[PDB]
RNA sequence: GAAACUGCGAAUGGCUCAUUAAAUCAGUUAUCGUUUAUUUGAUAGUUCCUUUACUACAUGGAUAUCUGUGGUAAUUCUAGAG
RNA sequence: UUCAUAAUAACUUUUCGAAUCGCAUGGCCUUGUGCUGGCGAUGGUUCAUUCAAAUUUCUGCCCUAUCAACUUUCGAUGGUAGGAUAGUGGCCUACCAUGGUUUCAACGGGUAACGGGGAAUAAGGGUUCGAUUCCGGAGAGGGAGCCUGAGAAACGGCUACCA
């Protein structure tokens, strides 16, 4: 009905916002940005509901204004700016750097990171095409277009963007026996190896993934994000190395590592 | 206004559908331009998402392509002789797409002369040399040649003049041209 | 019949009422953007030529 | 820093369930069938038109508010001049 | 894929290619006030993308035969070409063909029918309800018609008619 929608009801929000059912009718709708609405994570949520540096929206706004938050080197001032997967959130005071990565369960984890890694962003390849004047460009599944790419970078390949300038420093080819991260579905937040790649030339390629504990699962190709060569990831993965325990196992862990 | 909705239609079964929702602006369709010949007059229309289509009510000139030779020239359109959809259009002189029209042809003739030097109906040294290098390539379909003699070439419009404002096409060649001629003859 | 006289050279304006239809009869069936002499309007206005431009109906 | 011009928004929200029975809608596809402000990336030495004296150290005319003259029983009515 | 893209032909009542703003006041002397240069705002081209958008595939709706034939002059089903549209398409127009749906209920009638998530009940199976907090969809007394705009056939916009 008539043009774009501008609000978001609290229940209609992505569940991995971890937003509480009460204390409001509305949720912070991610503005038009680099990442998809449902796959994003607004700055407000990151600030208030994760790190707890702000108490309310006004506080968040104030924080933003003094030009201190930095999403991928660039500044940002939107409360509802949609930082998503692999995005580096740097705070100038505190000197903390964060990379937005998922965890074993599904939601965005607070993952503290060093300045040596915070310099670069890792990004999947969505499209490879020749643009105007015959100039080749690559499209990252995370927002960007990069002109004149290395011509053996194809779709689904992951790319090390140096972020400070925005040039491709290095890349990983999508292939069997390469460390992978799942970014959508039930298996989202899981880390694996790629055992096999089914095709079905028509609709949705399925990739078979084994983790470190020899525990195979299948996801769609567009949910699968390459991260390195097995055992050696290009980024630091969060605590619990994207592993997925069974519920009982988790409970046991909780019990046996008690230290109140 | 004229709407392109499939709401007002009957279903596959022949069932008359009930009137759900009043007609929308995204369903809309505007009046026919039905362009005439003589003195250039082009009205812009604001479409969806900004953008302009150009209604070409009254057009005189047009640039037409000789696909064999590989050249196109701006030329006067003088009359619609045949239109596949409707004889009414022909009667009117309504310039549309796929209509068959008569072109001034003089520019084409001039071009030909410049190129080969052979002329249709009956200097420097470099030019002569060039001509020599060419030749025998200058033969053409007989029908075209005949037309040239009269001074008016048959061409088909391939632009949608109601959409672009631009009125453009291709000079009639080969089998298609022959077919068109036959059709014309039949009509007479 | 009231009149709204404006002199653009000086940039000065005045409102002058007429109590007689004979003095206003000069304006009857005249169009906006026409030249009307002051002589027949008033014995006071002599050598004057008005441009009638704009006005208001009753109500 | 009132006003006014310009920009942007007013198509979201809120309410209601009258219509509506392959319609809506649900899950599922598709756009190699299109439009898309905004967004975040991209991106344009070529506007010249002969090349011995040329606006570019920057071109033109308006119009709002305002100041004044009013119209109407009246309205978020607006004429005339500067 | 007649794709992306490039190339030759020309066309065009020739779109765009910054006569725009704030704070900085830095660097070489050819010692002019010269040539320069920093961080930003707004803009602007096409391509991205994002928020969207129109359509769109397959499958699924409650009673009723005291509705068995229905659709096709006034588009019904298909073809061809055009027009129109943001674009696909009988969406509309011209010419042509005679199809399309149906006892595995078409079509018609009713609904004290908005659809769904769901709710009440509660061995298993079910039955009834869902105007209503979320998601779709409609509508702003009724019907039309449009302006502005990226987006409305908008009604705390306009134009008309009826009440
Ligand atoms: Mg596909
Ligand atoms: Mg556009
Ligand atoms: Mg305004
Ligand atoms: Mg609404
Ligand atoms: Mg092409
Ligand atoms: Mg067609
Ligand atoms: Mg009802
Ligand atoms: Mg119901
Ligand atoms: Mg309901
Ligand atoms: Mg009711
Ligand atoms: Mg009422
Ligand atoms: Mg309305
Ligand atoms: Mg109201
Ligand atoms: Mg409203």
For residues B12 and B50, state if they share a domain: no
Beta strands B61-66; B168-171: pairing state: parallel
* Domain containing residue A229: CATH number: 2.30.30.30
Q: Which residues are A209's β-sheet partners?
A: A217
For residues B53 and B112, state if they share a domain: no
Q: How far is CA A64 from CA A75, A83, A166, in A?
A: 9, 14, 23
User: What stretch of H or E contains C5?
Assistant: strand C2-7
Phi, psi torsion values for B52, nearest 5 degrees: -120, 130
Establish if A249 belongs to a structural domain: no
For residues A140 and A36, state if they share a domain: no
User: What stretch of H or E contains B66?
Assistant: strand B61-66
How many Å from the CA of A164 to C1' of E30?
39
- Which are the contacts of B80, defined by CB distance < 8 A and separation ≥ 6? B37, B89, B90, B92, B93, B94, B95, B99, B100, B101
For residues A98 and A204, state if they share a domain: no
Among A98, A116, A134, the domain boundary falls at A116
For residues B25 and B118, state if they share a domain: no
CB of B14 lies under 7 Å from some atom of strand D: no
How many Å from the CA of B6 to C1' of E56?
13
Q: Nucleotides on strand E with an atom closer than 7 A to protein CB?
A: 4-6, 8-13, 41, 46-56, 70-72, 75-77, 80-94, 99-101, 106-108, 117, 133-140, 143-146, 148-155
For residues B46 and B101, state if they share a domain: yes
* Burial (CB count within 10 angstroms: exposed 0-12, middle 13-18, buried 19+), residue A191: buried
What is the number of structural domains in chain A? 3
Rounded to whole angstroms, the Cα distance separating B127 from B130 reads 5
* Domain containing residue A26: CATH number: 3.10.290.10
Residue in the structure block whose two tokens are 């009718």:
A25
Establish if A140 belongs to a structural domain: yes
For residues B97 and B123, state if they share a domain: no
Q: Would you call A192 helix, strand, or coil by DSSP?
A: strand
H helical segments located in chain A: 43-44, 57-65, 115-118, 247-256
CB B78 within 8 Å of CB B56: no
Nucleotide nearest to A29 (CA to C1'): E51
Helix and strand tally (H, E) in chain A? 4, 18
For residues B42 and B101, state if they share a domain: yes
Among A153, A171, A189, the domain boundary falls at A171
Nucleotide nearest to B26 (CA to C1'): E54
For residues B37 and B17, state if they share a domain: no
- Which are the contacts of A65, defined by CB distance < 8 A and separation ≥ 6? A77
For residues B91 and B160, state if they share a domain: yes
Helix and strand tally (H, E) in chain C? 1, 4
For residues A24 and A38, state if they share a domain: yes
For residues B69 and B40, state if they share a domain: yes
User: What's the half-sphere exposure (Cβ side, CA atoms, 13 Å) at A235?
Assistant: 34
For residues A56 and A140, state if they share a domain: no
For residues B35 and B77, state if they share a domain: yes
Rounded to whole angstroms, the Cα distance separating B61 from B111 reads 18
Give the E-state strand segments of A97-175 in sequence order: 97-99, 101-102, 108-109, 112-113, 121-130, 136-140, 145-147, 158-161, 168-172
For residues A218 and A235, state if they share a domain: yes
Domain that includes residue A87, residue range: 1-116
For residues B100 and B174, state if they share a domain: yes
For residues A143 and A233, state if they share a domain: no
Give residue A113 CA to ligand 8 midpoint distance, Å. 54
* Domain containing residue A130: CATH number: 2.40.50.740
Q: Would you call A39 helix, strand, or coil by DSSP?
A: helix
CB A121 within 8 Å of CB A168: no
Order of strands, sheet of A121-130, starting from the edge strand that comes earlier in the sequence: A145-147, A136-140, A121-130, A158-161, A168-172
List the chains bordering chain B where 3 or more Cβ pairs fall under 8 Å: none
For residues A81 and A13, state if they share a domain: yes
Using alpha carbons only, give the angle A165, A170, A175 rounded to the nearest 5 degrees: 140
For residues B158 and B98, state if they share a domain: yes
Q: Nucleotides on strand D with an atom closer than 7 A to protein CB?
A: 10-14, 19-24, 29-30, 35-43, 68-74, 79-82
* Nearest residue to A73 (alpha-carbon basis) of A180, A189, A167: A167
Residue in the structure block whose two tokens are 């006005």:
C55
Nucleotide nearest to B17 (CA to C1'): D23
Establish if A259 belongs to a structural domain: no
Establish if A253 belongs to a structural domain: no
For residues A196 and A231, state if they share a domain: yes
* Nearest residue to A237 (alpha-carbon basis) of A177, A173, A170, A192: A192
Domain that includes residue B6, residue range: 1-30
* Nearest residue to A104 (alpha-carbon basis) of A37, A193, A186: A186
| Inter-helix orientation angle B174-187/B142-150, to 10° | 60
Establish if A252 belongs to a structural domain: no
Which residue has its C-alpha nearest to nucleotide E91's C1'? B4
Instruction: Encode chain A in three state secondary structure.
Output: CCCCCCCCECCCCCHHHCCCCCCCCECCCCCCCCCCHHHCCEHHHHHHHHHCCCCCHHHHHHHHHCCCEEECCECCCCCCCECCCCCEEEECCCCCEEECEECCCCCEECCEECHHHHCCEEEEEEEEEECHHHCEEEEECCCCEEECCCCCCCCCCEEEECCCCCCEEEEECCCCCCEEEECCCCCCCCEECCCEECCCCCCCCEEEECCCCCCCEEEEHHHEEEEEECCEECCCCCCCCCCCCCHHHHHHHHHHCCCC
Give the E-state strand segments of B10-144 in sequence order: 43-47, 50-55, 61-66, 71-82, 100-103
Q: Would you call A186 helix, strand, or coil by DSSP?
A: coil
* Nearest residue to A73 (alpha-carbon basis) of A92, A93, A45: A92
Establish if A254 belongs to a structural domain: no
* Burial (CB count within 10 angstroms: exposed 0-12, middle 13-18, buried 19+), residue A164: exposed
Phi, psi torsion values for B128, nearest 5 degrees: -60, -45
CA-based end-to-end distance of chain C: 13
What is the number of structural domains in chain B? 3
Establish if A250 belongs to a structural domain: no
User: What stretch of H or E contains B114?
Assistant: helix B106-115
């Amino acid at each position: 009905a008539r043009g774009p929608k501008k609000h978001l009801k609290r229940l209609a929000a992505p569940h991995h916002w971890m937003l509480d059912k009460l204390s409001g009718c509305y949720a912070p709708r991610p503005s038009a940005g680099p990442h998809k609405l449902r796959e994003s994570l607004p700055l407000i949520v990151f600030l208030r509901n994760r790190l707890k540096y702000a108490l309310n929206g006004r506080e968040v706004k104030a924080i933003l204004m003094q030009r201190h938050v930095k999403v991928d080197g660039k500044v940002r001032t939107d409360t509802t700016f949609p930082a998503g997967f692999m995005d580096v959130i740097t705070l100038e005071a505190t000197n903390e750097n964060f990379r937005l990565v998922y965890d074993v369960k599904g939601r965005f984890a607070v993952h503290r990171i060093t300045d040596e890694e915070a310099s670069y962003k890792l990004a999947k390849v969505k499209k490879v095409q020749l643009g105007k004047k015959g100039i080749p460009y690559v499209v990252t599944h995370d927002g960007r277009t990069i002109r004149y790419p290395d011509p053996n970078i194809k779709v689904n390949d992951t790319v090390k963007v140096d972020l400070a300038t925005g040039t491709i420093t290095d890349f990983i080819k999508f292939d069997t026996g390469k460390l992978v991260y799942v970014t959508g579905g039930r298996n989202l937040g899981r880390v694996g190896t790629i055992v096999h790649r089914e095709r079905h030339e028509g609709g949705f390629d399925l990739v078979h993934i084994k983790d470190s504990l020899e525990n195979t699962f299948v996801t769609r190709l567009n949910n699968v994000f390459v991260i390195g060569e097995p055992g050696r990831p290009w980024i630091s993965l969060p605590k619990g190395k994207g592993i997925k325990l069974t519920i009982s196992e988790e409970r046991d862990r909780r019990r046996a590592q008690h230290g109140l | 206004g004229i709407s392109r909705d499939s709401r007002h239609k009957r279903a596959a079964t022949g069932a008359k559908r009930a009137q759900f929702r009043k007609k929308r602006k995204f369903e809309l369709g505007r009046q026919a331009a039905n362009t005439k010949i003589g003195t250039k007059r082009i009205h812009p229309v604001r479409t969806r998402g900004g953008n302009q289509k150009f209604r070409a009510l009254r057009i005189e000139t047009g640039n037409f392509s000789w696909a064999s030779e590989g050249v196109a020239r701006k030329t006067r359109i003088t009359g619609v002789v045949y239109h596949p959809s409707n004889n009414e259009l022909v009667r009117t002189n309504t310039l549309t797409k796929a209509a068959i029209v008569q072109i001034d042809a003089t520019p084409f003739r001039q071009w030909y002369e410049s190129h080969y030097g052979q002329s249709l109906g009956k200097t420097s040294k470099n030019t002569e040399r060039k001509w020599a290098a060419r030749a025998a390539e200058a033969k053409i379909e007989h029908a075209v040649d005949s037309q040239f003699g009269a001074g008016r070439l048959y061409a088909a419009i391939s632009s949608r003049p109601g959409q672009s404002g631009r009125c453009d096409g291709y000079i009639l060649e080969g089998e298609e041209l022959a077919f068109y001629l036959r059709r014309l003859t039949a009509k007479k | 019949m009231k009149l709204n006289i404006s002199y653009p050279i000086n940039g000065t304006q005045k409102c002058i009422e007429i109590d007689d239809e004979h003095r206003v009869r000069v304006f009857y069936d005249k169009r906006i953007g026409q030249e009307v002499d002051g002589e027949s309007v008033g014995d006071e206005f002599k050598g004057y030529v008005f441009k009638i431009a704009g006005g208001n109906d009753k109500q």
